[PDB]
Design a protein around this ligand. Structure first.
Ligand SMILES: C[n+]1cn([C@@H]2O[C@H](COP(=O)(O)OP(=O)(O)O)[C@@H](O)[C@H]2O)c2nc(N)[nH]c(=O)c21
Ligand SMILES: Nc1ncnc2c1ncn2[C@@H]1O[C@H](CSCC[C@H](N)C(=O)O)[C@@H](O)[C@H]1O
Length: 467
C-alpha cells in the first residue's frame, strides 16, 4: 500500500483542447535515449577539456529542469528553443567546482590533501590562462602563503586545514571565477546547441514514422473536473514488446533493448492505465507505452534531485486537508491517480494532467513537492499566486521544499511574503523512501482557507504522520 488510486479528484479546470504532442513509440524513445547519452558524453568532454573537471554531480539533470522552465521547442525532454541561451543553473554549478570540486573529508590527512590540491590547481590556472595583473597577484600571493604555511614543521588539526581551505577559497574565488567565466558560459551554450540539433533529428524521425503509418499531423471556458492529457494526433500501431517476470521484476524487451521495473509498480501502471487511457480498450498498445515510460524516466535520471513523502503523510493530507492531487509527480511515484508530471506525451496514458506550469485549476486541494531546481520552484510560486488570485473558488496548496537559508532561495523567500500564506512550519528532512530540514507552506485563498483551514488539530494530525 504505497498509493491510493481510489481517491477521486477535486481539481476543477476549464475544458481544454487535446494536446499536439507526437504520440510516443519505442523506436523514437530509443533514439532519444541514444542521443541523450551522447549529449551527456559531450558535456563530460567539455568539462574535462575546458576546465579539467568532471561534470558537477546532478548538474545535467538539473539543467534539463531549468531549461524546461523557458523551453519553447518541440521535444518533451531535451531543450531546443530557450531564452536565455546560457543556463544560470549549469553555470552556477560548474563555477562552484572551479578550480576543483570540494569533496567530503573525514580525516586530518584528507583535509590537508584537499587544501593542497586546491592551492596547486589555482596556481596552474594563473600560470596557463589569461588573467589580469590584479587577479594574478592576489591568487599567487594567497597560494604562496598557503604553501609557506604547509611548509611549517609542526602540524595543525583537521579543522584548521578545513578553515584554511575555506579562507583560501573566499580570497581566490572571485579571481578564479573571472578567469573561467567566458569558458564556462561556452560550455553552457555549446551543450544547449548540440541538444537543439539532436531535437531536430528526433523530430524529423518521429514525423517520418507517423507518415509511414499514414497518420496525419495536422472548446470552452466550461469548468470540469480534471482529466488526463489527451493527444489530438492518432497513436501509431503497437510494436512488438515482450514481457516476462524474473524474481518479481517485470522485464520488457523492445528489439533487444531491455527495461525493468518492479512487479508492484507494473501492477500499479496497469491500474493507472485502466483509469486513464481511453484509446486502447484491448491493451494492444499497453506494453509499447510502458516500455516508453520506463525508458524515458531512465533517460531523465541517467540510470539526489527530489524527495518523496511518506504514505501516512499523504493519508493525513487527504484526511485533514482534502488533498486529492500532486502538483509534481510521475506515474511511478504518484500517490493519487491525478497529478502533474514532466512528460505529457507519455505520462497522460497513466493519469498525468501534464506539466504543472501549464495546469490551471480554478479550485481543489493540492500537494506540491517540486524537484530541487531553484528556477522551477520560483516559477512554481509565480504560478501559485496567479491561480490563487484568479479564482474565488476554494483553492489550496500545501508545499514541501527544503529549508535553504544560506543563501535563501527566491521561491522560499517569496512564499514567506505571500499574501496567501495561512501557515508555515518545519518537518523532518527528506529521507530516502523504500517504494537540511523541510519547510511546509500553506498557500490558500479565502475560500480555500475557509474550507480547509490549518487549525491546531489538523496540523497535529499531519505532524503525527511522521511520528
Ligand atoms: C544546499 N543548496 C542546494 N541549492 C541548489 O542546488 C544546487 C546544488 O547545490 P550543492 O550545495 O552544490 O549540492 P547539494 O544540494 O546536492 O548538496 C545549487 O546550485 C542550487 O541551485 C541551494 N540553493 C540555495 N539558494 N541555497 C542552498 O542552501 C542550496
Ligand atoms: N514541470 C513539472 N510538472 C510536474 N512535475 C514535474 C515537473 N518537472 C519534474 N516533475 C516531477 O516532479 C516530481 C518531484 S518528486 C515528488 C514525488 C511525489 N509525487 C511527491 O509529491 O512527494 C518528479 O517525479 C519529477 O519528475
Amino acid at each position: 500500500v504505497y498509493w491510493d488510486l481510489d481517491i477521486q479528484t477535486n481539481a476543477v479546470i476549464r475544458e481544454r483542447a487535446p494536446a499536439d504532442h507526437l504520440p510516443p513509440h519505442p523506436e523514437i524513445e530509443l533514439q532519444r535515449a541514444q542521443l541523450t547519452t551522447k549529449l551527456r558524453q559531450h558535456y563530460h568532454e567539455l568539462c574535462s577539456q575546458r576546465e579539467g573537471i568532471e561534470p558537477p554531480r546532478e548538474s545535467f539533470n538539473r539543467w534539463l529542469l531549468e531549461r524546461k522552465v523557458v523551453d519553447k521547442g518541440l521535444d518533451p525532454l531535451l531543450p531546443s528553443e530557450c531564452d536565455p541561451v546560457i543556463s544560470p543553473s549549469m553555470f552556477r554549478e560548474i563555477m562552484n567546482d572551479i578550480p576543483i570540486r570540494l569533496s567530503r573529508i573525514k580525516y586530518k590527512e584528507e583535509a590537508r590533501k584537499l587544501l593542497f590540491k586546491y592551492a596547486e590547481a589555482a596556481k596552474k590556472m594563473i600560470d596557463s590562462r589569461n588573467v589580469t595583473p590584479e587577479s594574478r597577484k592576489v591568487v599567487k600571493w594567497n597560494v604562496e602563503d598557503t604553501m609557506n604555511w604547509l611548509r611549517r614543521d609542526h602540524s595543525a588539526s583537521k579543522e584548521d586545514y578545513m578553515d584554511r581551505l575555506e579562507n583560501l577559497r573566499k580570497q581566490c574565488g572571485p579571481h578564479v571565477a573571472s578567469v573561467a567565466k567566458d569558458s564556462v558560459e561556452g560550455i553552457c551554450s555549446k551543450i544547449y546547441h548540440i541538444s537543439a540539433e539532436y531535437v531536430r533529428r528526433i523530430r524529423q524521425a518521429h514525423l517520418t514514422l507517423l507518415k509511414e503509418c499514414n497518420i496525419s499531423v495536422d472548446v470552452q471556458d466550461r469548468l470540469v473536473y480534471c482529466y488526463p492529457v489527451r493527444l489530438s494526433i492518432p497513436a501509431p500501431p503497437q510494436t512488438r514488446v515482450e514481457l516476462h517476470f524474473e524474481n518479481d521484476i517485470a522485464c520488457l524487451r523492445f528489439k533487444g533493448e531491455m527495461v525493468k521495473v518492479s512487479r508492484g509498480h507494473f501492477n500499479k501502471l496497469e491500474l493507472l492505465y485502466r483509469y486513464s487511457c481511453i484509446d486502447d480498450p484491448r491493451f494492444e498498445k499497453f506494453l509499447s507505452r510502458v516500455w516508453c515510460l520506463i525508458k524515458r524516466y531512465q533517460v531523465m535520471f541517467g540510470s539526489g534531485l527530489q524527495g518523496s513523502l511518506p504514505v501516512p503523510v499523504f493519508e493525513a493530507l487527504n484526511k485533514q486537508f482534502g488533498v486529492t492531487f500532486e502538483c509534481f509527480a510521475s506515474p511511478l511515484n504518484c500517490y493519487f491517480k491525478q497529478f502533474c508530471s514532466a512528460f505529457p506525451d507519455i505520462d497522460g496514458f497513466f493519469g498525468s494532467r501534464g506539466p504543472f506550469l501549464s495546469f490551471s485549476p480554478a479550485s481543489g486541494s493540492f500537494e506540491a513537492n517540486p524537484p530541487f531546481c531553484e528556477e522551477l520552484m520560483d516559477a512554481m510560486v509565480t504560478h501559485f499566486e496567479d491561480l490563487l488570485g484568479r479564482s474565488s473558488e476554494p483553492l489550496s496548496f500545501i508545499i514541501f521544499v527544503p529549508e535553504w537559508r544560506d543563501p535563501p532561495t527566491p521561491a522560499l523567500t517569496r512564499m514567506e511574503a505571500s499574501r496567501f500564506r495561512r501557515h508555515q512550519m518545519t518537518v523532518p528532512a527528506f529521507e530516502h523512501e523504500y517504494r537540511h530540514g523541510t519547510a511546509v507552506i500553506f498557500l490558500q485563498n479565502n475560500a480555500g482557507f475557509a474550507k480547509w483551514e490549518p487549525t491546531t488539530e489538523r496540523i497535529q494530525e499531519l505532524l503525527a504522520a511522521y511520528k
